[PDB]
Amino acid sequence: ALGIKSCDFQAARNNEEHHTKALSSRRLFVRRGQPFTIILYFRAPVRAFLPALKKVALTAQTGEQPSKINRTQATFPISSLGDRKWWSAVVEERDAQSWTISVTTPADAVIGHYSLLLQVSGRKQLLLGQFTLLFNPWNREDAVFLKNEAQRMEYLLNQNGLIYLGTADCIQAESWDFGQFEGDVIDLSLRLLSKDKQVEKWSQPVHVARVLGALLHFLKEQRVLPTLLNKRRGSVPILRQWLTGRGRPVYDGQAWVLAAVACTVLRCLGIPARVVTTFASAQGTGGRLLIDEYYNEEGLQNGEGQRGRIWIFQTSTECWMTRPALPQGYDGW
């Protein structure tokens, strides 16, 4: 006598509360460590609430082989005794035919695509719906927590960025569309992350950032071609071309866009990030603090260049998290 009719994931309001409104108003995008609310609809009225509450449990799984040892599978009941710092669920409001359930996730949960499943004593598992879990710069216990709301807006919610190019004495700001909240960027980023088989480590922003940076550098080396060809429309078309091979490729005179693409992926996954330009960057030294420049008697350079050169500028991705595996005092950028 506890048959489920439908489950309203309330994507619009939860997405507004979780700062994922720009992603969708129909798909549930939630940031870990923050409660979100779903509505459970029953086919028939629930006569006795307490025995019905004893008979129901919720299950959240991520990945293709969820397990309790990987923290990719979690089973929690619906009660006021649930651990609000862990996976939990509690009925905030109810009538005869519906339950308003507030579901929480741990601040160190594995990110990615999730399935919410209902288990009603003496019945089979029922799929309630799908939601995507992200990092939470708004949660104090998260590793990517940001103190300032203005910094949170700037480094996670703003899709209109500026990549600084030019020389040190003549800095030209180029408007850039990071587009991290485009409809496919989250799916593409999670698909790229799926090439890493340590899904248990996806709760760690350091591991996720390292994996995605390595993979995006590999894609940049694979897809960027030697020398309109310089017309750019932000990070999202570049990411689409790198991951799928379709679209306008990027040529080697604009190889600095890797920083912006990495910033877009990190921002879409919930890791605060910014693009940083260093003018007069000595690249290719291997740690050596010397640069050799060779000029002929006319004051000009003959060949194509040395391995260690002073670049006019170099872009780089900065990202914000704590460093638990590092000694004290290295949290931040």
């Binding site: 006598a1 003496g122 019945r123 089979k124």
Partner: protein, 804 residues
């Protein structure tokens, strides 16, 4: 009417010479020409959207030659190309190529087989037909109607449509020519004058099929309103107006992924209104349990329902599945005939024994298979029939009245009763026997069958108990007088082996192994293979005694001193009472009630809509035939027979083929039952074959039949769903819309009914079983609604397993 011809510019295959070959002809209905050289079937013309677009565009800027003073194809081509060049439709350098094209040999269907077929082509500048460059599309009409002339009125004037392709063209061109006087042309072999000429030429383009363009032009010319307007047209504008009104009243049918006859039939008012609007501006005008209140109406309707299907009733039996079913049902009807036979024989002074029951089971089965409306029923003797007969022999022996003669009078009253009920359509009340009563009766009868099958093994274990010591010289004639070693154990082994082999071959029928052909063949022959295997198993053990089948010596009476093959209605030894000549009504009423209930419920169970029976069942005809042959056989001291449930259900199952779990169809034919009855009659002749078949093998077969008869029983499923946690319950209407405890209470009420019926059976008042069964019809309708809701009863008690 009118005759229209369509010719395509094509190349032959032998000499590679381009020419004109006719492609289709219209006399209102369109006929198409296949590649073989014969004419396809006559059909209403359907046009494509692009063809009508092409025709409208080329007709808007067309070339009309109205009231043209000529009577020759060559000169008409000359004048048409002259007006083409004058209207700048073609360049003047193209006149030589098009006149060469328009005046080739116009070949017809009579010379297609003489040549090597026809292939599409394009006239090129050099006059050479090259191969078209655009992708080819084989004709839709040559794939739907052409794959397998007297209607022309004498005064009608023909129309010739010429379509051809010529790369030397900027755009497709249309020239419409009406002659002032109808003339015969060398292009048309039929002796009808030609009045209108359609010429459609041009270059391969996107969306221009010139065969479809010519089809559209010919269909437009075959339309009465356009033809009448064209006979009186004095300008191209009037023809364009007629074509505009033709397109205004056209029905375009868009593609859909759900093609249905009812959805298309919903467009009838649209079609009628479009026809009305097209002819509004024209001067012309457009050219089974029903109570029929009729006496014997149900019988006649059953006759008209089943007898039209008589030809399929013989042809559909030509499959090895039918032969395997015959082998199955032969034993399934022979062994109960023998068993019950000697019982009545041992309990009725051999007045009625195996001989009488073999002949009555044979004759009634033959005539019921040849005449009945549901041939899949098996006519045989039932337990209620053995008990009533013992009831009568007891009463007559008490009162001095004779047996055979009373039963002669019981049948005589039975015939009157059945004629009465068929006259007033009394077999209509079988519309109140819902699935409740049907399932209760079927499940109870299956349980009785299984119980008797196990009780026979218990009896043979009692006759030859397991002992330390035996007597090694025990008389065997007629049956062993004392216990024998290794008999009961071998019988149990044979019965278990037969059942196991039959079930394993049933599983192998639906299994995944061996070629799908051999597996199914082997699958339908599961029961015969099991019988053969166990018979050879017992035959190779010569020492151990096992009870075999026993058939009588010949086709004589079981007691030659008690009666003859016939019986005098007024007495055999003494004067029979005249009150018994009237008292025989009430026991005749009881026998009629028994046979009616058994046969009607058996027909209801077998002819369920979920079992894919599309040939119909005749309640009135089957009841009339069964009771009539019972009464007639009573005139010869022969037994009354009814459509028993287990044998008929087994016959239906053995003639049912399974799809890829799903019932596909049933081999509804008369050959199987006829052959079963013939073999039952001939069983006396083939005594050497039957004398080496043990009874234990047939006991295993009986257990198989009783177990497999519970397949479609929803009551059995709801029995099982009482021992399955309320989670594995399958998704069915009575599960998903009824609470689990409510369904269990409904099932328990049916269990109470089953227990009451089973207790009644094991009592001396076992003839009350039909009456107590018709106390479930009251409940299913009267009470039940008092404790249940409408949706609950709709889900639990459904006519065709529907969710209301």
């Amino acid at each position: 009417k009118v005759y229209v011809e369509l010719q395509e510019l094509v190349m032959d295959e032998k000499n590679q010479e381009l020419r004109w070959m006719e492609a289709a002809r219209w006399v209102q209905l369109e006929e198409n020409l296949g590649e073989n050289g014969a004419w396809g079937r006559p059909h209403l013309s359907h046009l494509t959207f692009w063809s009508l677009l092409e025709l409208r565009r080329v007709f808007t800027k067309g070339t009309v030659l109205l009231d043209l003073q000529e009577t020759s194809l060559a000169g008409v081509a000359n004048q048409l190309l002259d007006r083409f060049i004058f209207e700048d439709q073609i360049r003047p350098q193209d006149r030589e190529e098009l006149l060469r094209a328009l005046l080739l040999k116009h070949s017809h269907a009579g010379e297609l087989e003489a040549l090597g077929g026809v292939k599409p082509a394009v006239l090129t500048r050099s006059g050479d037909p090259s191969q078209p460059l655009l992708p080819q599309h084989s004709s839709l009409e040559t794939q739907l109607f052409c794959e397998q002339l007297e209607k022309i009125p004498p005064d009608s004037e023909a129309t010739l449509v010429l379509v051809g392709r010529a790369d030397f063209l900027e755009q497709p061109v249309l020239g419409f020519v009406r002659l002032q006087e109808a003339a015969e042309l060398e292009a048309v072999e039929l002796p009808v004058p030609i009045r209108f000429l359609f010429v459609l030429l041009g270059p391969e383009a996107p969306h221009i099929d010139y065969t479809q363009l010519g089809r559209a032009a010919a269909t437009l010319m075959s339309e009465r309103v356009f033809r009448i307007d064209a006979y009186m047209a004095q300008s191209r504008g009037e023809l364009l107006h007629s074509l505009e009104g033709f397109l205004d009243c056209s029905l375009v049918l868009p593609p859909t992924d759900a093609p249905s006859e009812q959805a298309l039939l919903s467009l009838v008012p649209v079609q009628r209104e479009l026809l009305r609007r097209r002819y509004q501006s024209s001067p012309a005008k457009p050219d089974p349990l029903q109570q029929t209140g009729q006496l014997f109406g149900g019988l006649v309707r059953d006759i008209r329902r089943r007898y039209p299907y008589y030809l399929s009733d013989i042809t559909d039996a030509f499959s090895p599945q039918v032969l395997a079913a015959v082998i199955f049902i032969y034993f399934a009807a022979l062994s109960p005939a023998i068993t019950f036979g000697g019982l009545l024989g041992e309990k009725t002074r051999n007045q009625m024994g195996v001989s009488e029951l073999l002949i009555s089971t044979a004759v009634q089965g033959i005539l019921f298979a040849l005449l009945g409306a549901q041939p899949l029923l098996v006519v045989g003797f039932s337990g209620p029939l053995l008990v009533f007969e013992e009831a009568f022999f007891s009463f007559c022996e008490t009162n001095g009245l004779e047996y055979i003669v009373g039963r002669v009078w019981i049948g005589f009253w039975l015939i009157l009763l059945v004629v009465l009920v068929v006259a007033f359509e009394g077999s209509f009340l079988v519309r109140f026997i819902s699935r409740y009563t049907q399932e209760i009766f079927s499940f109870l009868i299956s349980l009785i069958f299984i119980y008797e099958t196990f009780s026979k093994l218990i009896k043979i274990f009692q006759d030859h108990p397991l002992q330390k010591t035996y007597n090694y010289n025990v008389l065997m004639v007629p049956k062993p007088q004392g216990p024998l070693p290794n008999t009961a154990l071998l019988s149990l082994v044979l019965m278990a082996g037969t059942f196991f082999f039959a079930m394993m071959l049933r599983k192998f029928k639906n299994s995944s192994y061996f070629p799908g052909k051999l597996r199914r063949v082997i699958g339908d022959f599961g029961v015969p293979i099991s019988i053969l295997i166990m018979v050879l198993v017992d035959f190779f053990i010569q020492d151990t005694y096992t009870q075999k089948l026993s058939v009588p010596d010949g086709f004589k009476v079981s007691n030659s001193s008690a009666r003859g093959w016939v019986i005098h209605p007024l007495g055999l030894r003494s004067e029979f009472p005249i009150w018994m000549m009237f008292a025989s009504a009430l026991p005749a009423l009881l026998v009629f009630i028994l046979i009616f209930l058994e046969s009607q419920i058996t027909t209801l169970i077998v002819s369920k809509p979920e079992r894919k029976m599309v040939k119909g069942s005749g309640f009135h005809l089957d009841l009339l035939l069964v009771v009539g042959m019972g009464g007639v056989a009573a005139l010869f001291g022969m037994p009354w027979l009814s459509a028993t449930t287990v044998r008929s259900v087994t016959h239906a199952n053995a003639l049912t083929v399974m799809g890829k779990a799903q019932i596909q169809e049933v081999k509804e034919q008369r050959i199987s039952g006829l052959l079963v009855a013939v073999l039952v009659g001939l069983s006396i002749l083939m005594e050497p074959i039957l004398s080496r078949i043990p009874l234990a093998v047939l006991f295993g077969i009986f257990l198989y039949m009783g177990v497999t008869s519970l397949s479609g029983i929803q009551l059995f499923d709801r029995i099982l769903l009482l021992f399955k946690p309320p989670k594995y319950h399958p998704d069915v209407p009575y599960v998903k819309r009824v609470k689990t405890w409510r369904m269990h209470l409904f099932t328990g009420i049916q269990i109470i009914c089953l227990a009451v019926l089973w207790v009644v059976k094991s009592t001396p008042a076992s003839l009350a079983l039909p009456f107590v069964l018709i106390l479930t019809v009251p409940l299913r309708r009267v009470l039940l609604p008092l404790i249940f809701r409408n949706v609950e009863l709709q889900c639990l008690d459904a006519d065709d397993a529907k969710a209301t």
